[PDB]
Design a protein around this ligand. Sequence first.
Ligand SMILES: CNc1cc(Nc2cc(C)cc(C)c2)nn2c(C(N)=O)cnc12
Length: 248
Amino acid sequence: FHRVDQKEITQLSHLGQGTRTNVYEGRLRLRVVLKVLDPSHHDIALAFYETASLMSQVSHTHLAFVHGVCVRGPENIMVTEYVEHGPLDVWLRRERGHVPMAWKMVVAQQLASALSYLENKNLVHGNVCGRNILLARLGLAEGTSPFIKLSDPGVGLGALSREERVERIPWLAPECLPSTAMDKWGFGATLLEICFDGEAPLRSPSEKEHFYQRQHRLPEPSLATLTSQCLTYEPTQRPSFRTILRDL
Ligand SMILES: CNc1cc(Nc2cc(C)cc(C)c2)nn2c(C(N)=O)cnc12
């Protein structure tokens, strides 16, 4: 990744919070987003640097760009693409009941394309969810289509606590509660979330953890065969993104 000096960035309005991060609008000597990691253990900063490294080595129409990393005292900052309309989950809840199925199918295909690209390079995202899908274009006007960018996955899944992994249910693959196969589950859970206008299935941390421990399966979408195949507890039985992209 590219090293960004603190003199090259300007921190503006708070946008929201991610896992161990605060996300702000900013300027780069370009409008950007600044993902400020909390003062953290070296294992967490390393998992954050691994994400910056992964996203700086890939290039895809539907993957958000990473400008680089800035170290500002105890704060690690990932300088990433400012995407015009922000997260898909927020937008879906605001537009609940007025998002057509054809619009949702375009998003699913664009997301499956980004994930097929990663799968072919044997790279894991590990945080596929509506919150990490950003809208560059809304596709509300006649003759237009939405355009998504899959955000960086933030602090790597391998560095998170059990409590943080439970907070990720239902996007978290069940085998991760105690491989590219995990993104097939994240993809399936994101299709449910999109189908339900940003209302993902599953509640308290104990109820979510009990759901996976008891091997219960997620609700069917209101995409039924595809979610049923992606959301299986057997990782090797999940279809490839080549097959998913064909089935879509
Ligand atoms: C207008 N643009 C954007 C808004 C936004 N808001 C946001 C909204 C919540 C609820 C949470 C977080 C972490 C950010 N995030 N974002 C990103 C990104 N998180 O990578 C990239 N561009 C944008």
